[PDB]
Design a protein around this ligand. Structure first.
Ligand SMILES: *[C@@H]1O[C@H](CO)[C@@H](O[C@@H]2O[C@H](CO)[C@@H](O)[C@H](O)[C@H]2NC(C)=O)[C@H](O)[C@H]1NC(C)=O
Ligand SMILES: *[C@@H]1O[C@H](CO)[C@@H](O[C@@H]2O[C@H](CO)[C@@H](O)[C@H](O)[C@H]2NC(C)=O)[C@H](O)[C@H]1NC(C)=O
Ligand SMILES: *[C@@H]1O[C@H](CO)[C@@H](O[C@@H]2O[C@H](CO)[C@@H](O)[C@H](O)[C@H]2NC(C)=O)[C@H](O)[C@H]1NC(C)=O
Ligand SMILES: *[C@@H]1O[C@H](CO)[C@@H](O)[C@H](O)[C@H]1NC(C)=O
Ligand SMILES: *[C@@H]1O[C@H](CO)[C@@H](O)[C@H](O)[C@H]1NC(C)=O
Ligand SMILES: *[C@@H]1O[C@H](CO)[C@@H](O)[C@H](O)[C@H]1NC(C)=O
Ligand SMILES: *[C@@H]1O[C@H](CO)[C@@H](O)[C@H](O)[C@H]1NC(C)=O
Ligand SMILES: *[C@@H]1O[C@H](CO)[C@@H](O)[C@H](O)[C@H]1NC(C)=O
Ligand SMILES: *[C@@H]1O[C@H](CO)[C@@H](O)[C@H](O)[C@H]1NC(C)=O
Ligand SMILES: *[C@@H]1O[C@H](CO)[C@@H](O)[C@H](O)[C@H]1NC(C)=O
Lengths: 207, 725, 725
């Protein structure tokens, strides 16, 4: 049994908000293969950070890969309150995880998306005249409520979407705005890997 | 003695001189004598020469206009001027160095360009050619391209389409420069789905097949153009890379439906203040956005949004007013309506929702002309409680209870209507007057409000007019059940209260319109009163705009109801006066005096003998969305379809049998289409009402061609003379 | 007594009864009484009900018209009639079986059908739907498609386009049936390169955006359509195989340039007579054109072509005439111009170039009505030397010297203007009368020339009109340097030559126009003469037809010179009579009459005081190619351009300062576009002339909708009474 790593570079990567959360159970993994396949631009794993996570055993392994421009690495660094960490994605420092960046040349089998996208404004309009605008921050590890307007990706920068949330969601209109960075010449990938210790279910182990 | 004849009017025999100047610096301005651009020194007035009369720059191309560079090293010369709409045109521009004396012949501005402007300081040009924006950092240097997505009649980059130009902006330019000129901010309008209006242009005796003119025109309730706002950094333009623009999105309270962009204003050199309007023009959000050096974007914060609601009607006199920021950029002064319903200046902080009104009373401020560090200058109709008079005041920013009138006691008998032009840094200002007497221009020093000199006294015209019989003018009020409503009468020469006089009643009756003010004029009414001995009265009923938000907002969602009955009651009140002949009473107006005239004649009152409707509005669903939806809402069965269908001229056609009607319209009209008059005429033919009609070929809304402007008034002055026997 | 009033004219208080019958055999015709279709035996007069008023059995659609199958076993029922042009329209049809009792619901004719016709013998139907021809052998059975190339405004299969329908064919049907109904001959048109005219048709009141009407309209000198001729054998049709249409190509004399098809006619059951004409309408060639049994093609010999030319003018009155073939088909009769210029009847043979004149004199033959094996029946203006009258004659084909007039002396002091309808085989004929008296219909026998009975003598109108004060009518001539030209005057009741009367000069002055005829009319001139005591005169000068080709062709290539001058001289000689008031003289027209009115009023003559020009012509380069290029040639510098520019109304706009001019035009006009008045108005404005205008929105050339028809004439009546005070 092996922890299939083909899926990370399979097909077109998604945007930052619509990440594909990933899980491994009772398998065998080799992070060095991913490191060799992808030329790493920056490496800032925090917490346990044993210069890598390829020797410890875990109950499960989580990957939160997305396609991100290297220009914006700072917003997703810890202790930021930018648009990315508010409406797009915030790293879950409550549990063992860390941060990985890389880029992809033409030698790889990966297909570039149309363009890089991220959410700029995700608000809740309430009150008569729809006047109070109350931003919806996102808890770490959770999809934004504004993801579903354009899951695959945003067409152009400056898209004004809208939806009326049900009484369960809290009520009021939900306005989502997306931003589109023009596509870079070379493709880039950003990974956030989460590792979880099993007290009595420590199955996933390195080869 | 003579009188004021139709020849004296159509030929401009008596011509009012102007004094138009351009403040290039804090103490110097550029007047223009015979053909010479002369630079004047404000404090002394000694007038050295800037450019001699020898204008053979292109040697044959007549220079339509010029635009000196802010630094003064270049002059922009325009020619080949072709007009499109009221504010639109295309021309050709050539630059001419003043440091050298050589016309620039390299990297020229293309022949058919729509709008060209200089930077506020320095020498940069931004021009719109074929719906695209170009920048020239140096006049003799190849241009840079910013927008590649411009198409004719679909997408406008840096210029406005018909509807925004006509109503939302009242200008053809949608590109704005930073106080440096570092950034250039422009708007993109998208007319993909707005329906087109098609009319015929015959265009010559030689053109065998008449042309069809197709304009993107949203009629009331139709699809409406979208807006995108971008800001581009001019200081980082290069040939190797196509330019990048940063888009600024509207606040999410505007993104839930359809919205406009009604104002753009720069606060600091890194802070732009955008101001949006919801399609139902009850709501408006003003957004202060700060350029972020690290991000490179423009962050529009939520805590700085200033929302203005109008519960009893639309917001703004015609659109929400612009801020007047301070030097620091952390506060601004804006004219908003107070609790009593009178529009006054209230002092805002950037990051605080509340503001503090600094002026109050039973009057309205019209504009904030200039904001000095220690003073604020504004135009108000406070003086003597006359809504039809404007004056200039200053208010101390340290103490708001110290207000001085800088233009109240200069010449009370001759000037009561003022407009000011302020120098840079507000150290000098020119007082342009058009009050009861002849216009009078003076220059003043702002240091201690000294009166320097009289630039233009209009003394030649005074001597010319001392030998003609000129009409008087009366400006008084009548009371309607509690309130004060102001009217005016152009009284004939040697007016006698015992004699009976015919009455013609000039109408606009537009929402937020002043028709009884103190401005001096020489127009068709002067002919009527002088030669024909006809009283030409104008009335301010409900819906007028400088008397409060209780008078102006009374016609909210009720166009054609109070505007029309107030004029009939005004005519009845005038008839109660001894001098008006009740049998000969007529009404007329230009398109909204036209709408109101048609509605008044088709009402069965019996007051008016006859009426002239010029380019009238017929049905409010034939008109553009920005104007009509402001005052009436959407033509849907939920919102206001009932009064959209109950306020038509056509459904009043059976009462036109007691009236004499003259219906005039230009067949190439783009604003109030020929469809209006065609559908009026069809509705009066279908019921058997006799009337007179006249079409003007190839003419737009404001019939202005010298031959046609001479023809229409000669036709109308014959119809009136036939009415009044 | 009372007088004819605008109420009596515009409401048709006094009506003329008409006996519209429809022959179906040698001795039976169908007349529609109250709602029943009757059958009358012509020898005795007894009647029987062919179809009782069961037309309400459908009850879902009102029956606009009906068409009985020639044998008499079916009938078509029109409904949903919609008018396109003067002759074009669309309607939906139903077939009612007159044999069982039952209305056919199997394979019904489509809703938006354009043309439908019955085969001359049998019950076969050919109809046009979406510019395509379908043939129904049996009404029960489905239809076989003939043409697959039909397209909207591009290819017209079996119907005419605008220009051919309006000028050339004067009909919407471009398909012809063989005498037995064996062959179906049709014409295909191609408007690919013909330029389009565009005008605004607004709507009823409830349309937000006006729509644009685009019609393929060739103007003088522009690209014309292209025509093709085909003949089909309908007996050999089958559902499995598409039909085969055999083209008949135009003769080599026509293929060199641009040509017209101007006539089709079936000589024998297998011999067609196509008549072609050139764009330079001086030269026409007829193609007596046969069918081969073995080949199946229509080879069409050169020895049987007949060339007609015109050195002085154009071929035909409005078109080349039509051959009246002999039964065997080896001979035919036709009206062509002699060496003296007058039009008379030629006996031709298909194989000989010469024709023999069987009629000759200083008169013309208006038409050949019936041709039998022993006699030829024709309508002529020979009697009394008056071109106004039209009586009926016959000639013995064996002895051409024997001429008998069948209608000269029937009722000489009451009938002088006759029309005749002939039964099949010319056994009985109905002589329609409209001359100097109330119309009179009578049925006659061809065997002995005896009056069987009086069908409709209009006896109730002769009793109603003895209570009204009715105008007279004068018809005489005036000599212009050698020649007598005929005029008419509708004199006021109780006319007295001692007193002076106004004069309105009704004008058409078109080429080949009879205006001083003998017909009895009840129209606006009857109003004017009866109520307003105005004289309404008409005159026939140079260019008027039916008096020879010297008068008719006098205006060749010089349209707008002799027509105008003859009208002015006629007005002068009227004014120099003892009963015309010199000051009050006017002139008006609806067409080429409007052109002549404008060019007479703006000529500086000084005779006239006033004038109305309804739907006038201004330039000949704005009008269609067929009409203008027949009388004026092409507008090219080498042929005729000096006179396409030198005879226009707008070139005389400075002479309108001496007259009062009313200009009326309907804004949706296909024939004489609104452009031609919209540029007269512009030229009048540009020079400073005050004129009165009026537009009738959505109205067409013949403003005839009831409300618009009353408005136009009440407006014109007011204008005339104002001119004459
Ligand atoms: C201007 O607006 C039109 C319509 O609002 C935009 O055209 C649309 O483009 C999207 C993009 O795929 C299509 O799915 C739609 O079908 C288009 N609508 C049409 C053609 O009516 C157009 O992109 C806009 N132009 C800009 C933003 O520059
Ligand atoms: C900047 O972007 C524009 C995008 O429109 C480029 O212009 C287009 O270039 C492509 C070639 O890749 C052409 O096929 C298009 O026709 C161009 N558009 C127009 C409107 O002409 C432009 O080349 C880019 N600039 C640079 C320096 O790369
Ligand atoms: C107005 O112009 C001055 C220079 O003429 C600008 O000064 C520089 O602005 C940039 C930002 O674009 C800063 O990064 C530099 O530090 C400034 N100082 C320099 C280059 O010496 C000034 O910022 C401009 N105002 C703006 C852009 O609002
Ligand atoms: C006016 O005079 C002052 C000195 O009195 C001089 O400095 C200034 O340049 C003069 N202005 C002009 C426009 O020449
Ligand atoms: C420009 O030069 C002088 C200025 O004093 C004078 O002749 C006139 O104003 C101008 N000359 C011409 C030819 O316009
Ligand atoms: C404008 O047109 C003229 C004449 O066609 C030409 O000489 C000139 O170079 C053009 N200028 C530009 C900037 O295209
Ligand atoms: C403005 O109009 C809308 C719709 O007519 C209404 O709901 C609202 O209460 C009005 N006032 C404000 C302040 O929005
Ligand atoms: C014509 O239209 C009517 C509806 O008005 C429909 O009932 C009928 O079937 C149609 N006839 C044909 C032949 O399509
Ligand atoms: C009609 O005309 C066009 C262009 O003149 C030509 O291409 C075509 O062959 C013609 N005939 C048709 C469409 O049957
Ligand atoms: C053109 O002018 C007059 C009238 O306009 C006409 O009589 C004359 O014969 C014409 N002459 C030429 C050279 O076309």
């Amino acid at each position: 049994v092996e922890c299939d790593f083909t899926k990370l570079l399979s097909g077109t990567p998604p945007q930052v908000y619509n990440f594909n959360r990933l899980v491994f159970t009772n398998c065998n993994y080799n992070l060095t293969k991913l490191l060799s396949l992808f030329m790493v631009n920056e490496f800032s794993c925090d917490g346990i950070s044993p210069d890598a996570i390829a020797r410890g055993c875990y109950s499960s392994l989580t990957v939160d890969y997305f396609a991100y421009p290297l220009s914006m690495k700072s917003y997703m660094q810890p202790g930021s309150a930018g648009v990315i960490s508010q409406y797009n994605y915030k790293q879950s420092f409550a549990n063992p995880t860390c941060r990985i960046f890389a880029t992809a040349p033409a030698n790889l089998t990966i297909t570039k998306p149309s363009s890089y996208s991220f959410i700029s404004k995700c608000s809740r309009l309430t009150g008569d005249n729809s006047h109070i605008e109350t931003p919806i921050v996102i808890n770490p590890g959770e999809y934004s409520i504004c993801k579903n307007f354009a899951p695959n990706g945003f067409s152009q920068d400056g898209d004004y979407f809208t939806r009326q949330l049900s009484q369960l969601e809290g009520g009021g209109i939900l306005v989502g705005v997306g931003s589109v960075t023009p596509m870079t010449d070379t493709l880039q990938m950003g990974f956030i890997i989460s590792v979880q210790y099993g007290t009595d279910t420590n199955s996933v182990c390195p080869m | 003695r003579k009188t004021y004849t139709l020849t004296d009017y159509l030929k401009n025999t008596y011509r009012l001189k102007l004094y138009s100047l351009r403040w290039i610096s804090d103490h110097e301005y550029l007047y223009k004598q015979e053909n010479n651009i002369l630079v004047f020194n404000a404090e002394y007035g000694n007038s050295s020469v800037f450019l001699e009369n020898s204008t053979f720059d292109e040697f044959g191309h007549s220079i339509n206009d010029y635009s000196i560079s802010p630094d003064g090293q270049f002059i922009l010369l325009e020619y080949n001027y072709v007009k499109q709409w009221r504010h639109s045109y295309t021309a050709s521009y050539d630059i001419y160095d003043l440091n050298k004396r050589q016309l620039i012949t390299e990297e020229r501005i293309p022949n058919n360009t729509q709008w060209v402007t200089w930077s506020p300081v320095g020498h940069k040009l931004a021009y719109v050619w074929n719906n695209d924006i170009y920048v020239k950092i140096e006049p003799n240097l190849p241009s840079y391209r910013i927008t590649w997505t411009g198409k004719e009649d679909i997408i406008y980059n840096g210029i406005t389409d018909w509807v925004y130009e006509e109503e939302v902006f009242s200008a053809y330019s949608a590109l704005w420069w930073s106080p440096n000129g570092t950034f250039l901010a422009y708007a993109q309008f998208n007319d993909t789905e707005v329906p087109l209006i098609e009319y015929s242009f015959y265009s010559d005796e030689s053109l065998q097949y008449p042309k069809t003119v197709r304009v993107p025109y949203p009629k009331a309730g139709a699809v409406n153009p979208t807006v995108k706002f971008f800001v581009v950094n001019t200081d980082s333009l290069s040939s190797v890379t196509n330019a990048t623009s940063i888009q600024i999105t509207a606040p999410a309270s505007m993104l839930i439906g359809d919205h406009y962009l009604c104002d753009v204003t720069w606060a600091t050199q890194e802070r732009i203040s955008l101001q949006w309007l919801r399609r139902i023009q009850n709501y408006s959000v003003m957004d202060i956005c700060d350029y972020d050096e690290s991000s490179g974007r423009w962050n529009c914060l939520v805590a700085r949004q200033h929302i203005e609601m109008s519960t009893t009607g639309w917001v703004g006199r015609f659109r929400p007013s612009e801020p007047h920021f301070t030097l620091d950029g952390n506060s601004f002064y804006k004219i908003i309506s107070n609790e009593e319903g009178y529009r006054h200046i209230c002092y805002f902080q950037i990051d605080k929702k509340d503001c503090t009104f600094i002026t109050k009373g039973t009057w309205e401020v019209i504009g904030i002309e200039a904001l000095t560090s220690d003073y604020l200058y504004y135009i108000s109709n406070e003086y003597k409680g006359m809504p039809g008079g404007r004056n200039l005041y200053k208010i101390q920013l340290s103490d708001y209870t110290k207000v001085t009138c800088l233009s109240c006691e200069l010449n009370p008998e001759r000037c009561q209507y003022y407009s000011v032009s302020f120098s840079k840094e507000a150290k000098y200002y020119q007082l342009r007057c058009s009050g009861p007497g002849l216009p009078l221009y003076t220059l003043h020093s702002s240091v201690n409000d000294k009166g320097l000199r009289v630039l233009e006294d209009n003394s030649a015209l005074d001597k010319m007019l001392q030998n003609v019989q000129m009409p008087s003018k009366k400006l008084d009020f009548i009371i309607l059940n509690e309130t004060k409503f102001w009217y005016q009468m152009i009284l004939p020469p040697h007016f006698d209260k015992s004699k009976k006089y015919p009455l013609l009643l000039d109408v606009y009756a537009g929402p937020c319109s002043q028709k009884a003010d103190t401005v001096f004029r020489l127009n068709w009414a002067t002919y009527l009163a002088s030669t024909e001995n006809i009283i030409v009265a104008s009335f301010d009923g409900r819906g007028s705009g400088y008397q409060g938000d209780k008078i102006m907002h009374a016609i909210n969602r009720r166009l054609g109801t109070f505007e029309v009955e107030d004029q009939i009651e005004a005519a009845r009140q005038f008839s109660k006066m001894g001098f008006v002949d009740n049998k000969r009473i007529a009404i007329w107006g230009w398109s909204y005096g036209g709408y109101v005239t048609s509605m008044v004649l088709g009402s069965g009152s019996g007051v008016f003998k006859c009426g002239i409707a010029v380019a009238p509005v017929s049905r409010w669903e034939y008109y553009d969305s920005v104007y009509t939806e402001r005052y009436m809402g959407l033509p849907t069965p939920e919102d206001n379809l009932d009064h959209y269908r109950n306020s038509t001229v056509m459904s009043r056609a059976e009462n036109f049998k007691q009236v004499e009607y003259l219906l005039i319209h230009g067949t190439a009209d783009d604003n109030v289409h020929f469809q209006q008059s065609a559908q009026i005429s069809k509705a009066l033919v279908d019921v058997g009402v006799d009337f007179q009609a006249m079409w003007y070929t190839d003419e737009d809304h404001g019939i202005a061609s010298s031959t046609a402007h001479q023809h229409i008034y000669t036709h109308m002055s014959h119809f009136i003379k036939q009415c009044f026997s």
